Amino acid sequence: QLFADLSREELTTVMSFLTQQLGPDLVDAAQARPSDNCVFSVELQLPPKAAALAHLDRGSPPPAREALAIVFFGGQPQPNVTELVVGPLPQPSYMRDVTVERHGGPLPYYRRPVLLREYLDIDQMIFNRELPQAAGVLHHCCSYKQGGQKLLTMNSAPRGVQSGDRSTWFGIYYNITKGGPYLHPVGLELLVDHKALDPADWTVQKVFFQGRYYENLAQLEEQFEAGQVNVVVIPDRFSVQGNRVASSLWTFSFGLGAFSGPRVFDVRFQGERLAYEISLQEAGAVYGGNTPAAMLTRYMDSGFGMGYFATPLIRGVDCPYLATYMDWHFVVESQTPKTLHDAFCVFEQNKGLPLRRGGVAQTVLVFRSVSTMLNYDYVWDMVFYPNGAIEVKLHATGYISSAFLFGAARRYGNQVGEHTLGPVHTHSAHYKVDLDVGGLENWVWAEDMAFVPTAIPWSPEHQIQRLQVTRKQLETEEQAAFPLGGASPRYLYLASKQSNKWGHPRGYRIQTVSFAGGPMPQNSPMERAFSWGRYQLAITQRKETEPSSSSVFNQNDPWTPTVDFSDFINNETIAGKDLVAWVTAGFLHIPHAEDIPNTVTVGNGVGFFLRPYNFFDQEPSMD
Amino acid sequence: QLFADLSREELTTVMSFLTQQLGPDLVDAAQARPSDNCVFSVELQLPPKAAALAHLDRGSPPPAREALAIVFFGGQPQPNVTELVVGPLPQPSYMRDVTVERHGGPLPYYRRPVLLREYLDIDQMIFNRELPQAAGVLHHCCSYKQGGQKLLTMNSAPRGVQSGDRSTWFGIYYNITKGGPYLHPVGLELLVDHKALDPADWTVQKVFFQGRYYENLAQLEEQFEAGQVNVVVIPDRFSVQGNRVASSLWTFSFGLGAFSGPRVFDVRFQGERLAYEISLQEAGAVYGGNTPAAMLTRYMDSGFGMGYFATPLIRGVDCPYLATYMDWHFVVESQTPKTLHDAFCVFEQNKGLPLRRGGVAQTVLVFRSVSTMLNYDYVWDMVFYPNGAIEVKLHATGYISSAFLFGAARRYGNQVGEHTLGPVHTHSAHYKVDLDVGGLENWVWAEDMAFVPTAIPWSPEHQIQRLQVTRKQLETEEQAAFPLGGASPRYLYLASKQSNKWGHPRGYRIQTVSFAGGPMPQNSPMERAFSWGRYQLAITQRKETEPSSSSVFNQNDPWTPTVDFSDFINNETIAGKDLVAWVTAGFLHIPHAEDIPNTVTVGNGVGFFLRPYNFFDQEPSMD
Ligand SMILES: *[C@@H]1O[C@H](CO)[C@@H](O[C@@H]2O[C@H](CO)[C@@H](O[C@@H]3O[C@H](CO)[C@@H](O)[C@H](O)[C@H]3NC(C)=O)[C@H](O)[C@H]2NC(C)=O)[C@H](O)[C@H]1NC(C)=O
Ligand SMILES: *[C@@H]1O[C@H](CO)[C@@H](O[C@@H]2O[C@H](CO)[C@@H](O[C@@H]3O[C@H](CO)[C@@H](O)[C@H](O)[C@H]3NC(C)=O)[C@H](O)[C@H]2NC(C)=O)[C@H](O)[C@H]1NC(C)=O
Ligand SMILES: Clc1cccc(Cl)c1N=C1NCCN1
Ligand SMILES: Clc1cccc(Cl)c1N=C1NCCN1
Ligand SMILES: [Ca+2]
Ligand SMILES: [Ca+2]
Ligand SMILES: [Ca+2]
Ligand SMILES: [Ca+2]
Numbered sequence A, B: 001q002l003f004a005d006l007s008r009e010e011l012t013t014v015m016s017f018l019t020q021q022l023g024p025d026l027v028d029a030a031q032a033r034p035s036d037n038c039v040f041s042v043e044l045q046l047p048p049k050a051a052a053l054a055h056l057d058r059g060s061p062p063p064a065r066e067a068l069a070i071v072f073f074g075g076q077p078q079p080n081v082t083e084l085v086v087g088p089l090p091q092p093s094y095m096r097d098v099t100v101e102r103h104g105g106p107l108p109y110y111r112r113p114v115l116l117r118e119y120l121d122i123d124q125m126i127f128n129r130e131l132p133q134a135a136g137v138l139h140h141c142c143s144y145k146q147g148g149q150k151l152l153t154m155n156s157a158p159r160g161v162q163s164g165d166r167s168t169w170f171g172i173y174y175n176i177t178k179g180g181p182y183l184h185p186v187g188l189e190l191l192v193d194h195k196a197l198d199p200a201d202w203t204v205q206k207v208f209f210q211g212r213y214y215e216n217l218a219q220l221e222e223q224f225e226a227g228q229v230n231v232v233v234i235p236d237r238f239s240v241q242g243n244r245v246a247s248s249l250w251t252f253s254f255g256l257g258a259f260s261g262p263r264v265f266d267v268r269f270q271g272e273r274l275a276y277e278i279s280l281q282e283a284g285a286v287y288g289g290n291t292p293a294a295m296l297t298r299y300m301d302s303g304f305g306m307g308y309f310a311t312p313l314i315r316g317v318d319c320p321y322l323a324t325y326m327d328w329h330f331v332v333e334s335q336t337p338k339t340l341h342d343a344f345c346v347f348e349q350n351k352g353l354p355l356r357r358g359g360v361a362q363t364v365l366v367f368r369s370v371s372t373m374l375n376y377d378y379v380w381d382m383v384f385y386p387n388g389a390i391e392v393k394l395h396a397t398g399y400i401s402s403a404f405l406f407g408a409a410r411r412y413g414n415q416v417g418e419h420t421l422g423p424v425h426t427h428s429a430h431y432k433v434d435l436d437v438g439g440l441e442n443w444v445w446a447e448d449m450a451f452v453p454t455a456i457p458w459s460p461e462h463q464i465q466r467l468q469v470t471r472k473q474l475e476t477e478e479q480a481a482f483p484l485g486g487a488s489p490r491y492l493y494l495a496s497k498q499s500n501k502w503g504h505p506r507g508y509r510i511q512t513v514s515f516a517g518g519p520m521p522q523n524s525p526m527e528r529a530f531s532w533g534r535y536q537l538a539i540t541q542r543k544e545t546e547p548s549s550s551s552v553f554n555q556n557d558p559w560t561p562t563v564d565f566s567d568f569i570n571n572e573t574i575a576g577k578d579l580v581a582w583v584t585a586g587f588l589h590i591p592h593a594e595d596i597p598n599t600v601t602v603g604n605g606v607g608f609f610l611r612p613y614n615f616f617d618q619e620p621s622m623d
């Protein structure tokens, strides 16, 4: 319960403490304007490892239970975003601004995530005071307002060309609310500068219509009237109790980061802790296209929220009928705690494949949850094997984002329908794998194979390409940073100080199970924000100053990243320290006809494996 | 059903015809000595494709149903192995020799696989003539027959250092009869020369005792008696009619080659053929060590028989209790047909993960078979997805090979017991994927992603790394032969002539999934026999003269291979021809403590994916 997500009651307490303690008068974030003071979110502040392990292993008292509140200070001479550490629960006595502490300075107010109320005010502007200025061309293309269809908007990110920018390409789509929302692009995109704290000052800085750009909608309308614009017509055996799952072989505390997504703590196999924490850090997406949004889009999904955008799992569909179903509570953009029903599910999965052949079939423990944004869907799986192996997979599915088809559009994807292109994109996800193999003190090994031509002892006149094992202990972080798209040692394992019964260092190896979306060139002005994408796998010294490889604040200002993961790799020693492993997994997705109306989970996904390597003395037991 | 394996009735008739034609001097292969004449095996002769398709598609009469008989002609001045085509079934009248026609000449007698009678005769020699010579050292190390555990022999291959050799290193192991009978290597290996036609003339050419090499066993005993030898004492919807599966979505004819292994013909998703044939071709293993057998062993398992060594599927273990099980029939080293009970199992598996999202469940059809040699176990999987996708998967499991632990043994693996090493080795499998995408005439496309620094259209001063698609039609065989370990197109697919509704070439893409082992250096004078291991993927024109990428006769003479796969690649055009795909999957295996007593199929193994890429005009429907 030192890893348990804040209870609904706990959420209320922090919210009450803020109102009573904070000098500035706060507005409900659900109805907050840019120049208002509001609480964006409050959630569990993860405890220090040292105090947690002291409690977990040495019977010391639990660490002070704390919450981290994100506050939008827009109602002052100089607006800022402030992170407040509140605690200790159940009854708070302090409220510490750790902003400067964690980031070296203040959080620029433009890095703050776009409020829901900000989206709605952007819609008012578009529908009420922008779109009508191009009714003639909209009536023409898309039966606009004339007893015809309803249109809707799509968001994109980041929002500008440099730091300080808050200008978003919003696309116009049909409001067909069936199997596919952004499957009918109108080819009309609007660049709305919404950086100003006064919405009446927001403007459209440029328009994109079906191929070409215009300064504003008034310019587009007259060229249309003047018959100067060509318009394309668009038609249409284990027990969950609290945060703790316990089987005969496994024990772990689970949870959900409102921004970082699904996580698991204190992973113990048969009483022995394998890892302190296995958590999702960030989910990314890079697009390509000849239309603005698809041309520019680079998603750092934690800027939105993997937990905040998690959905209830449908019993029988998302998880087996006899699965265990847990709820989740959150305060993001609200006054009162909200509850997500069936956010998680744990169940037993008979693989149907013989685990060993006298033997028995492969039965697995599965921890699952789903994040959904605009209908796309990430299904996050954590599977725990009876032999001590852990499997972490990601599955993408749902509706793809679309682009209006014009010109050399096929240079950026495939046609999936009339006037519709499926733009290229790569999916990526970052995981923090804080293995504690045989305790804190860890080393890193790189074992692989080699063929060396040597003479045959019984026939020295003949040679034989001798297959043999190479081993190397990595000394610095730099040696253990493995570039995506390159080759890493086939057996890369974190080992303990001690060895097994046979003299081999007790180890758990990480096996990356993911094809290669393929890294963004470091020449990209925003690549630093997702520099975790450079590596297939990286090992660093765990620090309390390095809790995440990304940040909520990166999405809207990637040009100056709040968290630049590459900074973590700094030539420090990794021999005999508390080590963390960061795994990047993903794939290239060139959309195709089969992806319509939905992209299916067909395949076995993308992720990695954690497997015992000289950790036990022989094949372990099982119930 | 012209792809059906020969029935028992057919197997009997061919043997009768073969006995009548081949004089009165034939001998039951089960009891034949090297100088005898016997029928090694009789199995189905795969029909000509043109005639097969003409029958299936154009209603033309079925092509002649034939069998292939391998005959060991050791009874003559110049002994050879002969391949005979026998037909037509059901009542044969001819028996033609296709040996020269297929192999450019005679099959040398030393290439023939080692008969079971030959092995038993080798054991006799070892236990009657050989071991007794070293009774003193065996009593001391291994309680030879002093109330101690019994000894057995372990085979290895190839058998020599050059073409023409039949000299095998047999290892001596305790026969506990519990768990791994191969977990107790004594450190004694005999290099027996069983080349000669007269067993009485067979000799041991060298002996390896626990690290040291000796000329003969007597010398080893002599050396020991003189106290010049240290001895380490060793302790102690769908149904299936005949050969065809018929789900609501799929149709195919399954079978099993006596040597090649499991195979599928006439694969049809919703009535349309995707592939004429998908079959296992060869299974390989490459070891390392400082002990003889372990250092020399390179396997081409079809020399023993993936089918001949197939095992009964344990209901409720290898396949769900209520799956559909099918028997198999064969004649190998027997003049009477044998039955392999429950050789196959076909079943639907609820994937346990939603196909799409509320949404729909994901269930697959699974065709399984298991090959077993000395308790080491290949489980062959081909899963057909409701969306037209096909997953071919291989898992290994069971008892690993052990070696006597001495010297720089850890350079060749890990100690897994007392005086026991787990030698390094790679596993590999070759599959023949004859895709007929939209018909015979097929092309090959290479698709991937790329970034191009381009100015932002709405902000000229700034740049954006523009993600885009690259497409390239491959023209010759050499272009489609991608080296194992290197990087290849993320989107390589065979395409028909027709485009989809949207104008994209209808194709099925080959996504190769493996932690590929690591190719044997081409400097090795024997890797030519398994030159298929060079490429993770290769595409060649289909040829009736290139039915397989390996041969039963490769194993015992890899230095002059009967089939050298790379010969297929000869700069021929692959633009609008009958194309065949060849896929290599494998992995490096450094044995660990968890492999004892036996290694688990944990995770998912190795193989590949066949995915529809613009083959349809939208997501396919299900029934
Ligand atoms: C982001 O904005 C935050 C909220 O405006 C700033 O935090 C506040 O700064 C205030 C002004 O300095 C502090 O007020 C102090 O409180 C005393 C009463 O105790 C007043 O009399 C003083 O005017 C003032 N004292 C001074 C000069 O420090 C608040 O204590 C403080 N509020 C909280 C909750 O921290 C941040 O400074 C700003 N971030 C950055 C880094 O600029
Ligand atoms: C591998 O061995 C095979 C059998 O030992 C050889 O093939 C045999 O050779 C026989 C004698 O040369 C053939 O008999 C000849 O052919 C006709 C056909 O039946 C016979 O009537 C004749 O008696 C004889 N020729 C003449 C004119 O005297 C056998 O037909 C044949 N046996 C079988 C069953 O195939 C192969 O030659 C040898 N491999 C090679 C290619 O060298
Ligand atoms: Cl949430 C999700 C699921 C699958 C693929 C992507 Cl790229 C996703 N990410 C986003 N969707 C729109 C904003 N981010
Ligand atoms: Cl048949 C099999 C199953 C699993 C692994 C290997 Cl290397 C196998 N191959 C051989 N075992 C002994 C002869 N070859
Ligand atoms: Ca660091
Ligand atoms: Ca650690
Ligand atoms: Ca060829
Ligand atoms: Ca073909």
Ligand SMILES: [Cl-]
Pocket: A387, A389, A611, A612, B602
């Ligand atoms: Cl494992």
Ligand SMILES: [Cl-]
Pocket: A524, A525, B463, B464, B465, B466
């Ligand atoms: Cl970019």
Ligand SMILES: [Cl-]
Pocket: A594, A602, B387, B389, B611, B612
């Ligand atoms: Cl697919």
Ligand SMILES: [Cu+2]
Pocket: A396, A400, A425, A427, A589, A599
């Ligand atoms: Cu996608």
Ligand SMILES: [Cu+2]
Pocket: B396, B400, B425, B427, B589
């Ligand atoms: Cu193995």
